[PDB]
Design an enzyme around this catalytic site. Structure first.
Site, mmCIF file in Angstrom:
data_model
loop_
_atom_site.group_PDB
_atom_site.id
_atom_site.type_symbol
_atom_site.label_atom_id
_atom_site.label_comp_id
_atom_site.label_asym_id
_atom_site.label_seq_id
_atom_site.Cartn_x
_atom_site.Cartn_y
_atom_site.Cartn_z
ATOM 1 C CD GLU B 69 1.768 10.850 -22.734
ATOM 2 O OE1 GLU B 69 0.510 12.338 -22.228
ATOM 3 O OE2 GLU B 69 1.965 10.537 -22.024
ATOM 4 C CD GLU B 145 5.445 14.997 -21.696
ATOM 5 O OE1 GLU B 145 4.996 14.868 -20.490
ATOM 6 O OE2 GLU B 145 5.164 15.090 -23.068
HETATM 7 C C1 LIG Z 1 2.344 7.111 -16.751
HETATM 8 C C2 LIG Z 1 0.440 7.932 -16.029
HETATM 9 C C3 LIG Z 1 0.348 8.849 -15.080
HETATM 10 S S1 LIG Z 1 1.677 9.578 -18.022
HETATM 11 C C4 LIG Z 1 1.581 11.102 -17.901
HETATM 12 O O1 LIG Z 1 0.463 11.688 -17.335
HETATM 13 C C5 LIG Z 1 1.264 12.493 -16.662
HETATM 14 C C6 LIG Z 1 0.626 13.369 -15.771
HETATM 15 O O2 LIG Z 1 1.095 14.790 -15.589
HETATM 16 C C7 LIG Z 1 1.343 13.550 -17.636
HETATM 17 O O3 LIG Z 1 0.448 13.933 -18.512
HETATM 18 C C8 LIG Z 1 2.369 12.566 -18.239
HETATM 19 O O4 LIG Z 1 2.316 13.359 -19.506
HETATM 20 C C9 LIG Z 1 2.796 11.133 -18.951
HETATM 21 O O5 LIG Z 1 3.188 10.826 -19.435
#
Ligand SMILES: CC(C)S[C@@H]1O[C@H](CO)[C@H](O)[C@H](O)[C@H]1O
Ligand SMILES: [Mg+2]
Ligand code: NA
Ligand code: NA
Ligand code: NA
Lengths: 210, 211
Positions: B69, B145
């Protein structure tokens, strides 16, 4: 008096196993064609484009049969309605092809078309190409003609493109069938089918299977 | 990069590892603000190169990752090529900037759905089945993910596995994630309870999103 002996079955039947009624006879038109001794025996029309289709070249290869002569010419003219848009004139004698020369009995005409109206199933823009076989001083021997649609079909990056845009084929297979006449087709039935197809959002037909 | 014993244990017990550079700039606006900046290339480069120099002899490591990210910047392309040049034995993946950039050998989206497109501008999340057959696309797809297991979750998990098994180029993914990041706090009687964001006076916070 003509006599025609028509055989229902032949070795040709082995390549004619389509899922349809098996019939026989003289089922399409019969005609007589008069051509001069010195004649257009073949012609191919091609249309190529620049990247944005704002420019085209119409390329017409014309073949003749009969005695080859210096005074012989082909004029290919392109028409939009009653307006002549482009015209090319040339004697016979193609470019060199290999070690033995070229085709003395062929000529290729190249016409420039600026901002061609493009053919598609959405807007079927058509031009008329007239192929004139004539003497140098303009005595017509004969003319043939065809409808010309300026369009490019290509596959690029996994997509089938017409005039640079990806097609969505709304198609149907169509056999040549009449409940009273069998496999004889007429203009009225053909036109009926085409109107019904377009009215029901079809843009494509497959000539299943011939 | 993990504690060094982790790789030893994965070598010996048998788990495939994606080893990932310590680089995430999620909060930047836009996300690639730093990663597209040459002034940050030295700092990012060391996070990639020192990881490779440390872990390259571990058989459990099968794929290198440029981080997480951080959008897609020119720095990613440069470090992608660095790994490819130094270690041809392992693919390199990176999700940032739309999951299918020039900085990744594997289409590796996060939370792309099985059948449903999510066509965000600039960084769309296509249906995984659709993504594979985009014009010109040839790479394998493995989600970095998917199936966000937050609380009462994993609804629709079987839909992923059906697709994975039907499509050769859908080669699976990494569930998010293994273990709740809850912390222990104690009440007045010394009884322990699980705490999340905000429970330490930390503010701003993102509450239960750590679990
Ligand atoms: C749009 C946001 C919530 S980003 C989202 O947050 C998640 C929370 O558990 C993870 O960290 C993911 O990696 C991330 O893409
Ligand atoms: Mg059949
Ligand atoms: Na698969
Ligand atoms: Na908050
Ligand atoms: Na989280």
């Amino acid at each position: 008096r003509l006599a025609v002996m028509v055989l229902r079955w032949s070795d040709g039947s082995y390549l004619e196993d389509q899922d349809m009624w098996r019939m026989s006879g003289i089922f399409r038109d019969v005609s007589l064609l008069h051509k001069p001794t010195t004649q257009i025996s073949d012609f191919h029309v091609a249309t190529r484009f620049n990247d944005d289709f704002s420019r085209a070249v119409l390329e017409a290869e014309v073949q003749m049969c009969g005695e080859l002569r210096d005074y012989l010419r082909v004029t290919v003219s392109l028409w939009q309605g009653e307006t002549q848009v482009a015209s090319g004139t040339a004697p016979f004698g193609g470019e060199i092809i290999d070690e033995r020369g070229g085709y003395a009995d062929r000529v290729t005409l190249r016409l420039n078309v600026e901002n061609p109206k493009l053919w598609s199933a959405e807007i079927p823009n058509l031009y008329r190409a007239v192929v004139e076989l004539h003497t140098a001083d303009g005595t017509l021997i004969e003319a043939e003609a065809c409808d010309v649609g300026f369009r490019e079909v290509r596959i690029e990056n996994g997509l089938l493109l017409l005039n640079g845009k990806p097609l969505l084929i709304r198609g149907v297979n169509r056999h040549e069938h009449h409940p009273l006449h069998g496999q004889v087709m007429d203009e009225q039935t053909m036109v009926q089918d085409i109107l019904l197809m377009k009215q029901n959002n079809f843009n494509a037909v497959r000539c299943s299977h011939y | 990069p993990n504690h060094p014993l982790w790789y030893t244990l994965c070598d010996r017990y048998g788990l495939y590892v994606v080893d990932e550079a310590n680089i995430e700039t999620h909060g930047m606006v836009p996300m690639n603000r730093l990663t597209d900046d040459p002034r940050w290339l030295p700092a990012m480069s060391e996070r990639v190169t020192r990881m490779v120099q440390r872990d390259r002899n571990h058989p459990s490591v099968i794929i290198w990752s440029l981080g997480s990210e951080s959008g897609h910047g020119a720095n990613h392309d440069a470090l992608y090529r660095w790994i490819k040049s130094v270690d041809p034995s392992r693919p390199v993946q990176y999700e940032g900037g739309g999951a299918d950039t020039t900085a990744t050998d594997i289409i590796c989206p996060m939370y792309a759905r099985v059948d449903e497109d999510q066509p965000f501008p600039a960084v769309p999340k296509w249906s995984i089945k659709k993504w594979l057959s985009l014009p010109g696309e040839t790479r394998p797809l493995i989600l970095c993910e998917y199936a966000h297991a937050m609380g009462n979750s994993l609804g629709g998990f079987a839909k992923y596995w059906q697709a994975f098994r039907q499509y050769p180029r859908l080669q699976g993914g990494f569930v998010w994630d293994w273990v709740d990041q809850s912390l222990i706090k104690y009440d007045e009687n010394g009884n322990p309870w699980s705490a999340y964001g905000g429970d330490f006076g930390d503010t701003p916070n993102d509450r239960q999103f750590c679990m």
